[PDB]
Subunit: 298 residues, 6 copies
């Protein structure tokens, strides 16, 4: 299936500037060339125009920083993504902080009876204005897409929820706020924290993950946050957490998903060139994209 | 169970100065805060006064450097640890080179019918004045505790031995002197060198270890030497050995022990701030302690 | 005098992508805050729209890569810069590769009887299509501004030349092509290579430079290329050259210029976040700007 | 069985100079001392005289660079190795780029009814003048040994092929040329790329490998290319490829081979002191040799 | 003149923990051995007992954090230093944060008609409760010793001021608060910020400094703050500032003072092992002490 | 004047192995290409055959380790160098540890009425068997050349002394043994330790040096030891000493010597690839040679 790249230069979902440079950092890391080599009909639809956020002061919720700019950008993203899917193409969204997942899922989900989600991340991203300790919207996209949160975020695309909790699998988690641990526990979301990764091994985690979703979804969206990898492998992220997944574990995961042929959409987020070591993180993202799309060693 | 921290600023067990700053480096790394967050009644009993060693030439044995000072300090430690156990608390000892294990086990063992020991280390620490290639007492605490060595070390606390060989499990070993290899073989001590860890995996090593000790002990003392971790993960150690356990393997181990609920006392040794990279090692120790005491990602 | 910031996201002057992110990396490095603190009326006019280069094979000259896009973007820059000068403000241009100097000088020069130029760089940037060993226009802005080269570059702004050779001072040079060595020698351009900086000292080089230009110009434009600093100090540059000026030498230079009150316009170029170590270079640029604009330690 | 060391200061198999210093770097890394400690009768037969290759433009060799010099050096190596085997000694060849495998296998294979080969590498080394993308002979030794390629290479030692495809096992492969992927596919060579290593684990890979060859060979030659390890573990290699085998995985592999007692000859190649970090790579090689030859932690 | 070392394990003058380990970090870096080699009668009087500070809450001034504990420790220090001077020995105080300068000068000054001070630092340390932006007493010792500040600090030793502004020379300054710039300007304190160091050179700065003080003092106290050096040379400091003095500039300074024979007392402060890279900073301090005390290359 | 390169793969002058690889490391660092570009008639005479030194316990040489092998290799070097000078060529010797200076000066000095020597080093190399603290002959070449030491070393070439003390200038010295300090003092050798370099500046030191020797010699031999540069600039050296000359100071020195046209012979020693960071040190050497031979920035 032909691919369509959409860049979302977003940084309003959090506070470290530079994550808005992720789309071009990955383009510069050679994402087009990489995918063209795999004989893909790759197309670059450019970037979603993001508006500058109103200053905190006259702005409404500190528990929902930059809500309007974030909500509007995601509206545009949802539309762009919706059209790509309608055109029969695979939407590959490049971020940008994780709050863009709200728009990506808003444009994809409407097209599936039961869309599953693989949330590759160090965080759960299931906070609300009530549970969020930062007010950073990049820490709320999964909950908002599950129908939990401010209507400005939950109603993107004119419908909700975008997905069901039983159709979500979290991988590489190692930093959850108390409210989030409770949310995960109660909504019954499937999750493999680093303990399970260390205990079971990435192979078993991926096998179980793929089998689980394949048995109850009709499309799977890969929401890959680069901070899911160890800061040593992916240094250029705004909210890094030590003791993460390795470069190899990430490739195996992508390779196993490629093989499974279950990934119907994807987004690579949180790449921040301004916090990286010579574009290393964008590079990792591009390599991981290659594996996801079927690149093989043999 | 409430915890009691006892710092043992000891460096007389070896030759690299600075390991005596380990207790405070770990305190500065945030051990109290870490444990309080887990809802523990934590208490800091301060440090064991360590005397200074007498003139080397007017000392008794070259194969037992600083024997007088090491033996006396361990006497004090044993008493302090004994008291804590009597009070119904968990003794958490912060070192300090590994020679302090002699005092810790001396105050703990007397309280158990069959105390088991998990020795997480790159070394076996089963040398005697005869087999020791250095004369460094930090390389003799396990043998001494098993009743093998100079009476000045074997009789700490007025009894011996503190433990039985069949109740000991060595993990992470990758540097044994010939005499020690023979000792381990002959005393029949259970051991998982890096080969076994590489071959079986930390999960299997921990499963087997926990099952073994649980089936024949009434209390388990964790003697964790930071040099058990690779120098890249734990640079601040006096006698580093490459090709060690990773940060993740160490957390999984602690996590599986917490789960097992078998650890009745513990000590984290060999942290040397003066050989470290910005208190990295003291930090690792504190994090591993959090896991040991039940900290979880989810 | 109020300042006006103009970003020129240009990378068509050379081949390393990412230098187009220099303007925003410097903004993120805090250029506005830095200057506001010095009590300046600072204004950000945004960025100059840069078009994309046409197919290489259907381009006109290999010795003048991306001539069309580079020349047109420089036209826009010249206009913007011209306007700022007319408004009574100081034009502070943020790049972007060094080819943007062509546009900056084009909008500034017309306003001075004898505009002088201080070219802080590891290179001379005095190549033509004939002498250029790369075809990279970022290696031709000084010659072009002096009236030497392709008319598409020499006629920007509708006039030429922008400056006279006798009003130019090169500082920090350590990498000149043969053609350029000849050019400098023959046009009689004042130059202080690293040898002179090492032999005389930055203080003497700056004293001599300031005295020279002050005695025969009515305005001085500072064209500061970050690669003028050693790659250890400024790692984020496309064409680094070892054995460059230090961080301290650069601050002293800016500090002595501020003192002299001779700089009437400036530009900081070649900052490439994608080749940097955590925005270090953009940071250096911002600090040097603070000094240029009068920031003092006491 | 007594060991005989033969250094092959070869770099004509590729383009990065310095790999000819590999033999002395490893000797200086202490190969003799290491092996003597395991009570071996170790002997150093010095180095094979390598003749400088004539100008590429003068002698016909571009898809086969330095063919004459590489073919003759390998002739000498073949003889030296043949003689060592005849004397009842184990031939331990120290390289030198991988093209020397052609000579080593040429001197060993004639002595076995069915010699197996474990090719520990990031590459397949199964290119021919037709499929080679570089013309570097170090990328053709395995194919040439299997009887595929220029006669100057396939006929070394007066016979061919030296081995059969079904008796070859590739391990750690992560960089194969298209022609090579096809070669491996069609010749039916058993291969464990990094995907299999990540998926199955080194233990499994080694178990399967040892059992496979043990069931159908009468001798097994270990051709270990240091670039099979990750560049972070083995930095001093000419053609590094990221996402490689770890230090520990390599020790386990060597340890399990020692155990199986199947390795009848070996060569450690691609060590280049001039691209390394303080002889780190030669050191890893020496250590790995210690394990291969039975060195144990316990 | 014989030397007497007094360690002041102080960290209450600021907020980064670990600076209290500076005395032993320097002892471990070999300060005694170093000075003994220069044939000195060196004596170690141990450490000043420092009391733990009352918690901020019930504590008085936030503008004067830990005032009572800091004031009391300095009382003890002043007494210890006073006696050393009385015994005809040179007081060498090892810190500990800079707030200890209050006690050192309190014990020395009473013994001189006109005691001069060389304040080697990145900061001015001339803040008061009114001008301090942090409330950190380590940022007030020079002003307090000049008679400016809270009486609890200005009256240490029962007299004030300890020195006159005209007898003070600041060197390496590059980070002054506004109040401090004003204080320096108005009290007329002689100061060489990094601008003067870069402009004049360390040699001229030291020549001018030595001549100035020698012409109007009867004793000179060297208050050396390790953060006066660049964080690359002295990484282990709590409040580092980039663009500092080099290792060589520091040795030249010490060498030139040794030669001048004007230093009658000294203290090396701010060494923090917990923020350093393998005791590098304590090491630099010990080497600098060697030069100060006459160690020479020839 | 045409240049003749002679490699001397010597490491018997000290204990760190690998320095025998210095000649090829520099050749690989591009010494020929570098010099040819300056339009020189460069010729490579290969390497001097060095014989392995017999066991320390078997042949009498401990205050003079490897004396036989070092004395004879230097005999051969002396002849080779003598012949090059006779042919009217400039002898450029590539080492190899510093003991090779004995042979170089032995072949050059006989051709000059008053040969001067610039000894660029961190050491003085003026030890004798009596004063040597190591027994390493690389610490005795200058004394031996001045006619002080074992006859096996002082009589190389059939004559002595090769030079007079008043015609020697040491530069960059920062590590002298007591006997050496006395030797320099008494023989009245002109010396610029790092104190003088820091105090006067490299320009001044070089000006004074050139003028001194130019006024009283008829030829000047440059004996450049790479360890004269700081270990950060030249890491690959066996006996590094911190606080050394910078890369720039070395280039200025070489540049000023080229200018003076006084250097009639030279040798670059102590390059050890096995202790370096990717041939960095050989590279600095090559670069420094380029300058010495007239390479210029402009
Ligand atoms: N996307 C990262 C979220 C980080 C954190 N858990 C928060 O809610 O602020
Ligand atoms: N604590 C490390 C012990 C090191 C060695 N086995 C010895 O006994 O010296
Ligand atoms: N801006 C760097 C210029 C590099 C070189 N002189 C060239 O013209 O290619
Ligand atoms: N031994 C490395 C070979 C790399 C590549 N397949 C080539 O043939 O050039
Ligand atoms: N001793 C450092 C003082 C730091 C700062 N100027 C302050 O007053 O907080
Ligand atoms: N060339 C280095 C010599 C170092 C020391 N002076 C010695 O003679 O051992
Ligand atoms: Mn996320
Ligand atoms: Mn995340
Ligand atoms: Mn231990
Ligand atoms: Mn240990
Ligand atoms: Mn430029
Ligand atoms: Mn440049
Ligand atoms: Mn290979
Ligand atoms: Mn390979
Ligand atoms: Mn201070
Ligand atoms: Mn300071
Ligand atoms: Mn030397
Ligand atoms: Mn030297």
């Amino acid at each position: 299936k032909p691919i369509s790249i959409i860049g979302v230069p977003m940084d309003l979902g959090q506070t470290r500037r530079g994550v808005d440079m992720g789309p071009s950092a990955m383009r510069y890391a050679g994402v087009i060339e990489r995918l063209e080599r795999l004989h893909y009909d790759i197309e670059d639809l450019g970037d979603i125009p993001i508006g500058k956020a109103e200053r905190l002061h006259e702005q409404g919720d500190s528990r929902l920083r930059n809500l309007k700019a974030v909500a509007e950008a995601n509206e545009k993203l949802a539309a762009a993504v919706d059209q790509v899917v309608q055109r029969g193409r695979f939407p590959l969204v490049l971020g940008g902080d994780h709050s863009i997942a709200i728009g990506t899922l808003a444009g994809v989900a409407k097209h599936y009876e039961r869309l599953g989600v693989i949330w590759y991340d160090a965080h759960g991203d299931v906070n609300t204005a009530e549970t969020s300790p930062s007010g950073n919207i990049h820490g709320m996209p999964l909950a908002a897409s599950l129908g939990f949160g401010h209507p400005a975020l939950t109603q993107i695309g004119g419908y909700s929820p975008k997905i069901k909790p039983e159709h979500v699998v979290l991988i590489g988690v190692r930093s959850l706020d108390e409210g989030e641990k409770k949310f995960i526990r109660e909504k019954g979301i499937k999750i493999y924290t680093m303990h399970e990764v260390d205990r079971l091994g990435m192979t078993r985690v991926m096998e179980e993950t793929i089998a689980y979703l394949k048995e109850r979804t009709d499309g799977v969206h890969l929401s890959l946050d680069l901070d899911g990898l160890d800061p040593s492998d992916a240094p250029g992220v705004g909210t890094p957490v030590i003791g993460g997944l390795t470069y190899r574990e990430s490739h195996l995961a992508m390779e196993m998903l490629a093989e499974a042929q279950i990934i119907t959409s994807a987004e690579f987020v949180e790449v921040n060139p301004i916090l990286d070591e010579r574009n290393k993180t964008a590079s990792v993202a591009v390599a991981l994209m290659g594996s996801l799309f079927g690149e093989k060693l043999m």
